[PDB]
Enzyme design. Structure first.
Site, PDB file in Angstrom:
ATOM      1  CG  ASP A  39       8.860 -21.190  -1.537  1.00 30.88           C
ATOM      2  OD1 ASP A  39       9.737 -20.349  -1.390  1.00 30.88           O
ATOM      3  OD2 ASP A  39       8.263 -21.698  -0.549  1.00 30.88           O
ATOM      4  CG  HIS A  69      11.389 -19.772   1.773  1.00 30.40           C
ATOM      5  ND1 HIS A  69      10.191 -20.134   1.224  1.00 30.40           N
ATOM      6  CD2 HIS A  69      11.186 -19.718   3.124  1.00 30.40           C
ATOM      7  CE1 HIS A  69       9.302 -20.296   2.192  1.00 30.40           C
ATOM      8  NE2 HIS A  69       9.878 -20.044   3.348  1.00 30.40           N
ATOM      9  CG  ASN A 161       6.247 -18.525  10.205  1.00 29.93           C
ATOM     10  OD1 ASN A 161       5.771 -19.631  10.371  1.00 29.93           O
ATOM     11  ND2 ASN A 161       7.148 -18.280   9.269  1.00 29.93           N
ATOM     12  CB  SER A 224       8.012 -21.829   5.263  1.00 26.13           C
ATOM     13  OG  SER A 224       7.348 -20.678   4.856  1.00 26.13           O
TER      14      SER A 224
END
Ligand SMILES: [Ca+2]
Ligand SMILES: [Ca+2]
Length: 279
Positions: A39, A69, A161, A224
């Site tokens: 990530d 994130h 998403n 996520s």
């Protein structure tokens, strides 16, 4: 063990029903497992990681998570308060820049890195990788995720998403990994969650509280956020010896809460990650 007033997602993965507040989990808590969070990095210094997180690779100038994130996702895997697997070891691989973006070549490299690096780590209960990322379909990204899984790592990846079929996104569309959709606290598929035949499982993904950079916390939403619930659950289950990296996705699907979700299109699994904990 029981964490009272837990984030809804943790409560949800330890309940057959929505709306509870306590996260029930075996105290082994993923000890002896390792989860790589591929990530934007992990703010390993965050007190919520209790020294159990470390950066192991970056593809940018710094290993610092300048975005948040990755830290968030890592916290859902394994932070004390926000994590599924509260005693796992977290390894950060920074494939995404501080804007949250990464080229596919870098993401691939980071997966290959994990497949190798795990051989240098002491992870007696096994190794998971959490990939809260994705873009358009890419056979090469899918193949990298498949290699990582084949190498003996439980790979969990976000469905994406786009409120669309995950078949058009990668690594979501790689069959051999664990492709994770997102639900909300009312057991609806999250409004943004991708769906489709390639989804293996859903996890909590709407309004997920976790760690954030600057020693902070925040609630955000995404596949996520769902992915690290599953990654953490896998680590937890592997520590309990209930499954292995190769089989953990299927095990989680087989032991999931079935039929609890709404707004699941025909052809998409109606399975929500569940730890089946019994005190
Ligand atoms: Ca139920
Ligand atoms: Ca799969």
């Amino acid at each position: 063990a029981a964490q009272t007033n837990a984030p809804w997602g943790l409560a949800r993965i330890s309940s057959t029903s929505p709306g509870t507040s306590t996260y029930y989990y075996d105290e082994s808590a993923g000890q002896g497992s390792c989860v790589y969070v591929i990530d934007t990095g992990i703010e390993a210094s965050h007190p919520e990681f209790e020294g159990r997180a470390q950066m192991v690779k970056t593809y940018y100038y710094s290993s610092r998570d300048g975005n948040g994130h990755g830290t968030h996702c890592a916290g859902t895997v394994g932070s004390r308060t926000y994590g599924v697997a509260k005693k796992t070891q977290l390894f950060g691989v920074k494939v995404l820049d501080d804007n949250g973006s990464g080229q596919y070549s870098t993401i691939i490299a980071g997966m290959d890195f994990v497949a190798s690096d795990k051989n240098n780590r002491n992870c007696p209960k096994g190794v998971v990788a959490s990939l809260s990322l994705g873009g358009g379909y890419s056979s090469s990204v899918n193949s990298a995720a498949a290699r990582l899984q084949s190498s003996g790592v439980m790979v969990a990846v976000a469905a994406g998403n786009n409120n669309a079929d995950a078949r058009n996104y990668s690594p979501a569309s790689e069959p051999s990994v664990c492709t994770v959709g997102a639900s909300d606290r009312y057991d609806r598929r999250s409004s943004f969650s991708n769906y489709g035949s390639v989804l293996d499982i859903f996890g909590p993904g709407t309004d997920i509280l976790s760690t954030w950079i600057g020693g902070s916390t925040r609630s955000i939403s995404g596949t996520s956020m769902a992915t690290p619930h599953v990654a953490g659950l896998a680590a937890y289950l592997m520590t309990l010896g209930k499954t292995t990296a190769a089989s953990a996705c299927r095990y989680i699907a087989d032991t999931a809460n079935k039929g609890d979700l709404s707004n699941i299109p025909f052809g998409t699994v109606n399975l929500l990650a569940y730890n089946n904990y019994q005190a």
